[PDB]
Amino acid sequence: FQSNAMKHCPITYEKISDQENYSQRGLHLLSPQLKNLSPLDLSADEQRQEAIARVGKMSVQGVQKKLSAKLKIKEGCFEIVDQYGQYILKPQSDIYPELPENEAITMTLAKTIGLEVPVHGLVYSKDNSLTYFIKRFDRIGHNKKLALEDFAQLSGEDRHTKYKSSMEKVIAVIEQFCTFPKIEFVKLFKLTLFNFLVGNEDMHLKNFSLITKDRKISISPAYDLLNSTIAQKNTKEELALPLKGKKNNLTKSDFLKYFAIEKLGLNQNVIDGIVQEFHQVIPKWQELIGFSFLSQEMQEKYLELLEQRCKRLNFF
């Protein structure tokens, strides 16, 4: 067949047999008592139509079509809902290729480098298409939602503002509102290097949010991370928001000196240690991309971009 076999778990990427759809460890990340995960009973097209119709009740922001869902643990399936959803589902786009598979692997790469990333993965659909899922990090069960505000709201911008900002304004939000800004600066540094390496030119203003939890206001867990470059036919920029006024032709010193030191004030030992973490993780990322549910064509685009971004930071 034209597709290469996909022999790993859509949640953990560990090896599984042909007769399994998910690893046991993956099912248990959803719930230790989940014994199976049935496919969604809607095709990709039906899922998109439902997302469009349910958008007024959708309490999670983001322009991509999304569905709210609960996990029915004893039955072993997702159920689409309007209220008290615990998961977000993202079906295949009708425009861009492999968005669920791309977001799934990219979030997994972010988790591998130590960023805070919620449980996520892929679930099969009625038509065999893969839908992305992520656990809500602002609600557990039917309890109160934790306070969550995106950086457009916090920086005084209109609700629709995504690209008319800058990294320096993102930094200013953290300085103004976070309980321990210097802890958050380390996260921002890792996130921004990560986004450069994986081709995420769509880390826009509304992809940063502050959550109020455990007596502190902090940058939220990661959400909506994708190699947006490989999903598009043409891109002219590397960053969604300028850094040092630049959205392309970023240099190693722009990230490791201007950003890390002049803007974030990180000490050299901290910078050096994080850079080494990225150096060490590259072979694991390459292996995971190979184990992913991306097509061979998209794996090749991911790996080619990753190699070029690593070279620009002198990784090798």
Residue numbers in the entry: -4 to 311
Give the exact sentences the study uses for this entry.
Here, we perform structural and biochemical characterization of the Legionella pneumophila effector Lpg2370, demonstrating that it is a Ser/Thr kinase. Together with two upstream genes, lpg2370 constitutes the tripartite HipBST TA. Notably, the toxin Lpg2370 (HipTLp) and the antitoxin Lpg2369 (HipSLp) correspond to the C-terminus and N-terminus of HipA from HipBA TA, respectively. Structural analysis reveals that HipSLp binding induces a loop-to-helix shift in the P-loop of HipTLp, leading to the blockage of ATP binding and inhibition of the kinase activity.
In this work, we find that Lpg2370 in fact shares sequence identity with the C-terminus of the E. coli K-12 HipA, the toxin of type II TA system HipBA, which is then confirmed by experimental validation and determining the crystal structure of autophosphorylated Lpg2370 (pLpg2370). Like other members of the protein kinase superfamily, Lpg2370 has a globular kinase fold that can be further divided into N-lobe and C-lobe. The N-lobe, which contains the P-loop, is composed of sheets β1–5 sandwiched by helices α1 and α2, whereas the C-lobe is predominantly α-helical and consists of helix bundles α3–α6 and α8–α11 and a short β-sheet β6–8. In agreement with our LC-MS/MS results, we can observe a phosphate group covalently attached to the Ser54 residue. However, unlike HipAEc and HipASo whose P-loops are disordered upon serine autophosphorylation, the electron density of the Lpg2370 P-loop is well defined in the present structure. One prominent difference is that the Lpg2370 P-loop with phosphorylated Ser54 is exposed to solvent in an orientation similar to that of unphosphorylated P-loop of HipAEc, which upon serine autophosphorylation rotates by ~180° and bends away from the N-terminal lobe by 17.3 Å. Lpg2370 and HipAEc superimpose with a relatively large root-mean-square deviation (RMSD) value of 3.846 Å over 221 Cα atoms. Conversely, the six C-terminal α-helices of Lpg2370 and HipAEc, including the catalytic residues and some ATP-binding residues, are almost perfectly aligned. A comparison of the crystal structure of pHipTLp and the structures deposited in the PDB revealed that the autophosphorylated P-loop in HipTLp adopts an orientation similar to that of the P-loop in the crystal structure of E. coli HipA S150A mutant.
